Every structure is written in C-alpha cells, then in structure tokens.
C-alpha cells in the first residue's frame, strides 16, 4: 500500500520539503476546513488560487495547480480542482472522485517531467521535485461527504507512481 496514515495536523510546521495536496472548488473560496487555514497563513497563495479560479472557472475541473506557500520555501500547495462550488453546493460524489483521479494524474506527469500546472511555481521550487513528500488531509471526506474508502481506492491506483502521507483527525 502506497498510503501512510498519521494522526495529526498537516498544517503543523514540518522539517522537510513537502507538497500539500488539498481538494479545491473553482469558485475562488478557500472557505472552510484545511483551505481556510491555508488562506489565513499563506494569503499570497490564496490570491494565486483565486486568480486562477477567476481566469478559468470550472474549466479547471480535473486539473491541478501548484502554488508556492511564499512564506515557506519547503512547502508547495497543490490544488486538485474537483468541484465547481464549495460547501453544501459541492458536486456529485462520483464527479469528485473522477476529478480527483484526473488532477492527481496531472501531478504525476508533472513530477516525472521535472525529474498550466506549474506556472505560479517558476522559481519557488528550491529542491528537486521528487524530494517533496506528498501529503494531504482526508480530502473530500468532510464537507463534500465523499466516503474515505472510495477516495483511498483512487489514491491506490497510483501505487508505484506516487506515495502519499494522509493526515487524519
């Protein structure tokens, strides 16, 4: 299994380069959950996220955008665009699952290329890309109501390609 589970806050500051993967809406709202915490401590990353939502809207579904944290060069933010709207206006379960697989497949290809998705990055990537650990919360399982085992089966389709550390409550 390519998933490592840990109990704790993914946002607790860590000693190592890491890409923080989280599930996003196209509406320019980091309005809740981990996205809200990201909005409050990395406000320049939010501005990038909102701008790309402004530019493309729901043309982003199934795509991925890599953002520097700006305030910590060891930390990149990876937005999986899986829903048009956030909160209780989120998209249907299967669409979120499918879009999650699609955005993660763009990130997989981007990682192999370097060993739209990287345009805000150029110059904030200090280390080689294969050295950023891939970390995420239990994406889609809270506000979107997407059962974790269904999302786990999606992350499992990348065994060999990619390894993830998943933070849980």
mmCIF file of N, CA and C in Angstrom, residues 2 111 156-163:
data_model
loop_
_atom_site.group_PDB
_atom_site.id
_atom_site.type_symbol
_atom_site.label_atom_id
_atom_site.label_comp_id
_atom_site.label_asym_id
_atom_site.label_seq_id
_atom_site.Cartn_x
_atom_site.Cartn_y
_atom_site.Cartn_z
ATOM 1 N N UNK A 2 0.497 2.215 -0.878
ATOM 2 C CA UNK A 2 1.281 3.424 -1.077
ATOM 3 C C UNK A 2 0.837 4.577 -0.183
ATOM 4 N N UNK A 111 5.476 15.601 -12.094
ATOM 5 C CA UNK A 111 6.627 15.146 -11.316
ATOM 6 C C UNK A 111 7.642 14.407 -12.186
ATOM 7 N N UNK A 156 -4.954 4.605 -4.341
ATOM 8 C CA UNK A 156 -4.328 3.303 -4.549
ATOM 9 C C UNK A 156 -4.020 3.028 -6.019
ATOM 10 N N UNK A 157 -4.743 3.655 -6.954
ATOM 11 C CA UNK A 157 -4.466 3.435 -8.369
ATOM 12 C C UNK A 157 -3.124 4.011 -8.802
ATOM 13 N N UNK A 158 -2.453 4.779 -7.943
ATOM 14 C CA UNK A 158 -1.151 5.368 -8.251
ATOM 15 C C UNK A 158 0.001 4.658 -7.542
ATOM 16 N N UNK A 159 -0.243 3.475 -6.980
ATOM 17 C CA UNK A 159 0.823 2.717 -6.329
ATOM 18 C C UNK A 159 1.985 2.490 -7.287
ATOM 19 N N UNK A 160 3.178 2.866 -6.849
ATOM 20 C CA UNK A 160 4.327 2.790 -7.719
ATOM 21 C C UNK A 160 4.666 4.149 -8.286
ATOM 22 N N UNK A 161 3.679 4.797 -8.905
ATOM 23 C CA UNK A 161 3.878 6.169 -9.358
ATOM 24 C C UNK A 161 4.120 7.106 -8.180
ATOM 25 N N UNK A 162 3.256 7.046 -7.169
ATOM 26 C CA UNK A 162 3.209 8.095 -6.165
ATOM 27 C C UNK A 162 2.907 7.512 -4.800
ATOM 28 N N UNK A 163 3.472 8.142 -3.784
ATOM 29 C CA UNK A 163 3.237 7.772 -2.401
ATOM 30 C C UNK A 163 2.728 8.987 -1.645
#
